[PDB]
Design an enzyme around this catalytic site. Structure first.
Site, PDB file in Angstrom:
ATOM      1  N   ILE A  13       0.843  -1.224  -0.004  1.00  0.00           N
ATOM      2  CA  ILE A  13      -0.072  -0.130   0.083  1.00  0.00           C
ATOM      3  C   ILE A  13       0.856   1.447   0.028  1.00  0.00           C
ATOM      4  CG2 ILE A  13      -2.168  -1.270   0.757  1.00  0.00           C
ATOM      5  CD1 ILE A  13      -1.463   0.283   3.786  1.00  0.00           C
ATOM      6  N   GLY A  14       2.319   1.137  -0.100  1.00  0.00           N
ATOM      7  CA  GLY A  14       2.871   2.455   0.099  1.00  0.00           C
ATOM      8  C   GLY A  14       4.420   2.288   0.388  1.00  0.00           C
ATOM      9  N   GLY A  16       7.896   4.293   0.983  1.00  0.00           N
ATOM     10  CA  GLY A  16       8.311   5.678   1.676  1.00  0.00           C
ATOM     11  C   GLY A  16       9.970   5.731   1.626  1.00  0.00           C
ATOM     12  N   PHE A  18      11.491   5.345   4.238  1.00  0.00           N
ATOM     13  CA  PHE A  18      12.085   4.096   5.246  1.00  0.00           C
ATOM     14  C   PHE A  18      11.063   2.969   5.419  1.00  0.00           C
ATOM     15  CE2 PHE A  18      15.663   7.082   7.361  1.00  0.00           C
ATOM     16  CZ  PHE A  18      16.791   6.299   6.627  1.00  0.00           C
ATOM     17  N   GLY A  19      11.258   1.966   4.566  1.00  0.00           N
ATOM     18  CA  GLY A  19      10.357   1.016   4.621  1.00  0.00           C
ATOM     19  C   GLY A  19       8.944   1.066   3.638  1.00  0.00           C
ATOM     20  N   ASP A 135       7.952  15.095  12.341  1.00  0.00           N
ATOM     21  CA  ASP A 135       7.582  14.714  10.800  1.00  0.00           C
ATOM     22  C   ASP A 135       5.964  15.006  10.849  1.00  0.00           C
ATOM     23  OD1 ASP A 135       8.046  14.608   8.163  1.00  0.00           O
ATOM     24  OD2 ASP A 135       7.918  12.146   8.157  1.00  0.00           O
TER      25      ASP A 135
HETATM   26  N1  LIG Z   1      -1.170   1.677   9.610  1.00  0.00           N
HETATM   27  C1  LIG Z   1      -1.776   2.104   8.412  1.00  0.00           C
HETATM   28  N2  LIG Z   1      -2.765   1.437   8.061  1.00  0.00           N
HETATM   29  C2  LIG Z   1      -3.444   2.115   6.979  1.00  0.00           C
HETATM   30  N3  LIG Z   1      -2.737   2.568   5.919  1.00  0.00           N
HETATM   31  C3  LIG Z   1      -1.495   2.852   6.080  1.00  0.00           C
HETATM   32  N4  LIG Z   1      -0.966   3.555   5.218  1.00  0.00           N
HETATM   33  C4  LIG Z   1       0.541   4.006   5.384  1.00  0.00           C
HETATM   34  C5  LIG Z   1       1.212   3.773   6.522  1.00  0.00           C
HETATM   35  C6  LIG Z   1       0.663   3.196   7.697  1.00  0.00           C
HETATM   36  O1  LIG Z   1       0.995   2.762   8.530  1.00  0.00           O
HETATM   37  C7  LIG Z   1      -0.986   2.630   7.372  1.00  0.00           C
END
Ligand SMILES: Nc1ncnc2[nH]ccc(=O)c12
EC number: 2.7.11.30
Length: 303
Positions: A13-14, A16, A18-19, A135
């Site tokens: 889902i992402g 970044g 860092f990780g 941040d």
């Molecule tokens: N914990 C989360 N739950 C749903 N979406 C997310 N997107 C990005 C970082 C997160 O930690 C996150």
């Protein structure tokens, strides 16, 4: 580990700095898993360290589940497992939706309540140190199903040892998202040995976040399009220099449209923003005072 071996990753889902964050299933429930490679261990360990701070759990702080590692047979992955929030970031939520006055107050108060908890030192044997985010931005705040926020991405946090007035990782360099950097951070006047300076810098950033929310508040079908703070003054991914020129030299802030004076809720939000944005960190509201103000505003509205 026993936790990572029972988690199935379903969707990245992402990605970044860092990780990388994944949506995973743990014991039939949705969980977010932040995955780091072997060479990112210091980033992973610090974020685990912060998330395991005594008495940290709060309804407006991302719920941490576990640190773990997973060997896939070729390489080790460093995991941080936490609660999963389907709405994802406040950033995504505000891009996708407009909010009501009730909705706006809910997002603002929950953010302020989460920041007030982070900033609050709790004395005792199970004492919690005051923590500064460093941040804070709309991309680092998540939105829960009930329409409230929780602060996430605590990896860059600093913790205060109140007895000696020393910061656990004694920061020597500027960190965080340039756009949201406090004036004193941009121009390097901030006293990095002064913990209260870090909390004040978080408040400035929260004021920017409130502005982003308030633009998306719909009253009589009137609202602004989603925009990042300073969209009208700096390019995407701005530099410290681009930011200092605007925030410190020209001393401009995000514009408060006069029509926010028309609504009681947007008036309260606008005064808060202005009292977060003072170039002098000492004049800024505290997160607890913002929490007090918005709580007093919410009860009246009937949330
Ligand atoms: N914990 C989360 N739950 C749903 N979406 C997310 N997107 C990005 C970082 C997160 O930690 C996150």
């Amino acid at each position: 580990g026993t936790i990572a071996r029972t988690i199935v990753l379903q969707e990245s889902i992402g990605k970044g700095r860092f990780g990388e964050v994944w949506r995973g299933k743990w014991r039939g429930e949705e969980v977010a898993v932040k995955i780091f490679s072997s060479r990112e261990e210091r980033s992973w360990f610090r974020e685990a360290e912060i998330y395991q701070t005594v008495m940290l759990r709060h309804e407006n702080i991302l719920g941490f589940i576990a640190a773990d590692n997973k060997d896939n047979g070729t390489w080790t992955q460093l995991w941080l497992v936490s609660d999963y929030h389907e709405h994802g970031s406040l950033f995504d939520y505000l891009n996708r939706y407009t909010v009501t006055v009730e909705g706006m107050i809910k997002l603002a108060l929950s953010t302020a309540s989460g920041l007030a908890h982070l900033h609050m030192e709790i004395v005792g044997t199970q004492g919690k140190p005051a923590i500064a985010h460093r941040d804070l931005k709309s991309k680092n705040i998540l939105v829960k199903k009930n329409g409230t926020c929780c602060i996430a991405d605590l990896g860059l946090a600093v913790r205060h040892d109140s007895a000696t007035d020393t910061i656990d990782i004694a920061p020597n360099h500027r960190v965080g998202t340039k756009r949201y950097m406090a004036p004193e951070v941009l121009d390097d006047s901030i006293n990095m040995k002064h913990f209260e300076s870090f909390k004040r810098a978080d408040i400035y950033a929260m004021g920017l976040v409130f502005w982003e929310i308030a633009r998306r508040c719909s009253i009589g079908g009137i609202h602004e399009d989603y925009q990042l703070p300073y969209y009208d003054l700096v390019p995407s991914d701005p530099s410290v220099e681009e930011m200092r020129k605007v925030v410190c030299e020209q001393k401009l802030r995000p514009n408060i449209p006069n029509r926010w004076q028309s609504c009681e809720a947007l008036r309260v939000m606008a005064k808060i923003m202005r009292e977060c944005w003072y170039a002098n960190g000492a004049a800024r509201l505290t997160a607890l005072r913002i929490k007090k103000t918005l709580s007093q505003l919410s009860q009246q509205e009937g949330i």
